[PDB]
Amino acid sequence: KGPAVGIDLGTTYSCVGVFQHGKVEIIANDQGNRTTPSYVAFTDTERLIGDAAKNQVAMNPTNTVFDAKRLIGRRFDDAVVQSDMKHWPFMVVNDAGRPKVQVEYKGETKSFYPEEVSSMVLTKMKEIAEAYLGKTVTNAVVTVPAYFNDSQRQATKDAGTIAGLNVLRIINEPTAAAIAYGLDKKVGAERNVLIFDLGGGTFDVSILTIEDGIFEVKSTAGDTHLGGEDFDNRMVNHFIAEFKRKHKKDISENKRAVRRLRTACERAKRTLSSSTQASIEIDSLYEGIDFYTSITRARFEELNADLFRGTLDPVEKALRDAKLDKSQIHDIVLVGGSTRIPKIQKLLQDFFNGKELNKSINPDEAVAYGAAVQAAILSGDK
Ligand SMILES: [Cl-]
Ligand code: NA
């Protein structure tokens, strides 16, 4: 048993960390990326996992699988499954009451339970950890949403087992983020912690109470279908209209063109969290026509103004459910790359009358960070 690792198995991307020599190290994958898309794809000749999968989605949409976390621990008949499957290009089928994703792989029809798909992502995370450490990785803490039920938790454990991991503990994502910031190292009176978690595809607000290192989930709120991708999409539509003006062509039905634009918009979003201008640079976007343009932070904000303001409604609901006034929150913790958005941070701070945010740990890494901390404690290394 080498060091144990912490794995954030995310809806759209995943992240693995390890506690070593008094520090957490977030581990870059085989593409040099500190997060890995929760994607798997199948071609005539192979199975792709992570960046390779994500990067060929437009070329191979029916055999590229994502959002397995939406299915994990579910039954086919579930209202969530029935609704969600309407917006996936891959097939979901009923196996005796349990959903399976069905794809073509090497010209053959194959199908996989959600935890089998997730097991492939966990295998990727294990492998990148092993490549970094230069030794075997067996023990892990794996995180899940606080709202996950017993079935969802057990299926997640099953994904780990399938990947050859000994899952030391299933830990809640907000709890992991709080552990990252050492909020359970505070000694004294009860403390109320709000986690504001805006991922690629979901938005979670959680309120925890911590006392003597002991966590209680007081309330959860959010929107399981709101995330950074929504903000990217607003930019995408903006640029489709721009291309139409400038080049008198509508790229809307070309999946490859839209995908390359989407990728550019995602990059632009990140850029705009640190600078006031970002470029869109796409050689041969459509019919050989180049698209080189740019956008300001202000314009990005305007395009998304309603969605940004809308993030405070779940914050209000969570406080209501927890029977807490906004003034009773001791700590606000930011999780998810979109929480880097200055306008979001400003909206949140303004809501909390100027209170400062816990944001020094990369918000896309905070969950894996806390998972890594707890893995080291549980394995007897911290
Ligand atoms: Cl995600
Ligand atoms: Na997340």
Descriptive report:
This protein has 382 residues and is an alpha+beta fold. The chain folds into 4 domains: 1-65 and 121-185 and 359-382, Nucleotidyltransferase, domain 5 (2-Layer Sandwich), CATH 3.30.420; 66-120, Defensin A-like; 186-226 and 311-358, ATPase, nucleotide binding domain (Nucleotidyltransferase, domain 5), CATH 3.30.420; 227-310, Actin, Chain A, domain 4 (Alpha-Beta Complex). It contains 13 helices and 18 strands. It has helices at residues 51-55, 68-71, 79-84, 114-133, 150-162, 173-180, 228-247, 255-272, 297-303, 305-310, 312-321, 342-351, 366-378, and strands spanning 5-8, 13-20, 23-26, 36-37, 40-42, 47-49, 64-65, 91-95, 98-105, 108-112, 139-144, 166-172, 191-198, 203-211, 214-223, 277-286, 289-296, 331-335. The strands form 5 sheets. Strands 1, 2, 3, 4, 11 and 12 form a 6-stranded mixed β-sheet that branches. A 4-stranded mixed β-sheet has the order 15-14-13-18, with helices on both faces. It has a 3-stranded antiparallel β-sheet with strand order 6-5-7. Strand 2 (13-20) and strand 3 (23-26) form a beta hairpin. Helix 4 (114-133) packs across helix 5 and helix 7 (228-247) crosses helix 8 (255-272). The longest helix has 20 residues, at 114-133. The chain is globular, with a radius of gyration of 21 Å. The two termini are 15 Å apart. The structure holds chloride ion (CL) and sodium ion. Chloride ion is lined by residues 10-13, 199-201. Sodium ion binds at residues 10, 173, 197, 199, 336, 367. One of its GO terms (molecular function) is ATP-dependent protein folding chaperone. The modification Phosphoserine is found at residues 151, 327, 360. It catalyses: ATP + H2O = ADP + phosphate + H(+). ADP binds at residues 12-13, 200, 266, 269, 273, 337. The modification N6-succinyllysine is found at residue 317.
